[PDB]
Amino acid sequence: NSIQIGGLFPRGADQEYSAFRVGMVQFSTSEFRLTPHIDNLEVANSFAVTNAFCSQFSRGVYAIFGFYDKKSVNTITSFCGTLHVSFITPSFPTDGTHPFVIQMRPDLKGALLSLIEYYQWDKFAYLYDSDRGLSTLQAVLDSAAEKKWQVTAINVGNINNDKKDETYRSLFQDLELKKERRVILDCERDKVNDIVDQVITIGKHVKGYHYIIANLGFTDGDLLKIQFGGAEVSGFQIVDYDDSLVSKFIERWSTLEEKEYPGAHTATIKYTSALTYDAVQVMTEAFRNLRKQRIEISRRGNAGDCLANPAVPWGQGVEIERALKQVQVEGLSGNIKFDQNGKRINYTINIMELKTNGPRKIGYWSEVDKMVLTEDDTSGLEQKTVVVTT
């Protein structure tokens, strides 16, 4: 009972596809075995997106998978909403309650504001790429109004890579105009590491600065590069490497040859790939439940062209969405549960700090329990030599 499915992996995301293969291995079952229609197209090109989408639509696949640009979010959302076709993504969440949308990323927002409340900050810079969306900006400004915060947001992401060096010099000087000591970062990890390297060259990795990496994968960055600069650094993490399930996953992970599985032969992993494997588990078990439902849904390429006027979607997939939302199962990021709005719910996000020995947890963050500090202090390392000015 092999089940046709979509496959929209952006170029250069090899580790993700490899993780997808591992997901295909870990949950293969006799009741059914998935039938990917894997493609490698630019995520930015909404036209090509529509092309492959309508192609798989011609295949009439009962499910679709892939990422999306903020430029392309409206695309896939408009298609899932119009065609009543279920879809799953590990991309950043929509700001609206869009039907037929599944998403592996719990919002990092509330934990972030909670973190800010924990540090009881009042003034800070907020660097950001445009790409993940400005929702976090709208949020931090929103809290800034009530909390009398003095935001200094800046769009770093439009800067050309050709001279991705010159701008930074004036940029941090701009911070020096107010002597900001507190700078939230909101970019993808590559831009992150680059900018951190610039912080090294300008020497602002020195102690008394504080930093926040707004991403699910706090460990993914090259933190070792500035571990000893003395400036405090901390960030959120959705993936506990210490988990035994995760541990075994690593045990099968690094051991594999990177040739057959690029990006897999490492001690580390992108949170995205973990979201991928988790998505595989969720979808697979979902259809496993469909078999219990015994609600036959099989159809040919009845869907035909996507430009049917009006197009009239088949409603069995609408039921499939309901089957998806009700799924509640453990994954690499701990438990996975969905609201009928399709957002992940009742999840948890571990807090992380960069101790001098290395990165370290100090607590976890439920959406309902808000911030939750853990006692894990290891009975205190040292007082780190108190400064005494005079």
Site residues, a second copy (CB under 8 A): 45-48, 50-51, 54, 71-72, 74-75, 78-79, 81-83, 134, 138, 141-142, 144-146, 148, 150, 152-155, 169, 174, 177-178, 200-203, 205-206, 225, 228-230, 307, 309
* Amino acid found at 275: L
Cβ at position 371, least distance to ligand NAG in Å: 17
Query: Which option in a second copy, ligand NAG, none does residue 143 bind, with CB closer than 5 to 8 A by kind?
Result: none
Among 20-28, 54-62, 305-313, 332-340, the segment contacting ligand NAG (CB under 6 A): 332-340
Of 152 and 219, nearer to a second copy (C-beta) is 152
Cβ at position 275, least distance to ligand NAG in Å: 18
Contact flag: residue 337 with ligand NAG (CB under 6 A):
yes
Which has the closest alpha carbon to 197: 218, 217, 224? 224
Which has the closest alpha carbon to 159: 151, 171, 173? 171
Question: Which pair of structure tokens corresponds to residue 277?
Answer: 């494997």
Q: CB 180: neighbour CB atoms within 10 A?
A: 18
Among 153-161, 192-200, 334-342, 373-381, the segment contacting ligand NAG (CB under 6 A): 334-342
Cβ at position 27, least distance to ligand NAG in Å: 19
What 8-state DSSP symbol labels residue 209? B
Of 251 and 305, nearer to a second copy (C-beta) is 305
CA separation for the pair 239, 270 (Å, rounded): 9
Contact flag: residue 289 with ligand NAG (CB under 6 A):
no
Q: Got the DSSP string for 21-33?
A: HHHHHHT-BTTB-
Q: Got the DSSP string for 78-93?
A: HHHHHH---EEE-SPP
- Quick check: 72 and 41 in contact, CB under 8 A? no
Distance of CA 143 to the CA centre of its chain: 23
Of 21 and 205, nearer to a second copy (C-beta) is 205
Distances (CA, A) of 66 to 38, 289, 299, 374: 9, 23, 23, 36
* Amino acid found at 175: L
Query: Which option in ligand NAG, a second copy, none does residue 78 bind, with CB closer than 5 to 8 A by kind?
Result: a second copy
| Interhelix angle 14-26/271-293, nearest 10 degrees | 30
Of 188 and 197, nearer to a second copy (C-beta) is 197
Distances (CA, A) of 116 to 22, 108, 119, 140, 212: 37, 12, 5, 10, 10
Distance of CA 50 to the CA centre of its chain: 23
Question: Which pair of structure tokens corresponds to residue 23?
Answer: 């997901």
Of 199 and 352, nearer to a second copy (C-beta) is 199
Q: CB-based contacts of 18: which residues, under 8 Å, 6+ apart? A: 261, 262, 263, 264, 273
Of 37 and 337, nearer to ligand NAG (C-beta) is 337
List the one residue from 35, 155, 335, 341 that touches ligand NAG (CB under 6 A). Answer: 335
Query: Which option in a second copy, ligand NAG, none does residue 335 bind, with CB closer than 5 to 8 A by kind?
Result: ligand NAG
Contact flag: residue 346 with ligand NAG (CB under 6 A):
yes
CA separation for the pair 205, 230 (Å, rounded): 7
Of 72 and 333, nearer to ligand NAG (C-beta) is 333
Cβ at position 304, least distance to a second copy in Å: 14
Of 175 and 286, nearer to a second copy (C-beta) is 175
Of 43 and 351, nearer to a second copy (C-beta) is 43
Question: Which pair of structure tokens corresponds to residue 239?
Answer: 């993936």
Per-residue x/- track, 290-329, ligand NAG (CB under 6 A): --------------------------------------x-
Residues that bind ligand NAG (CB under 6 A): 328, 334-335, 337, 346
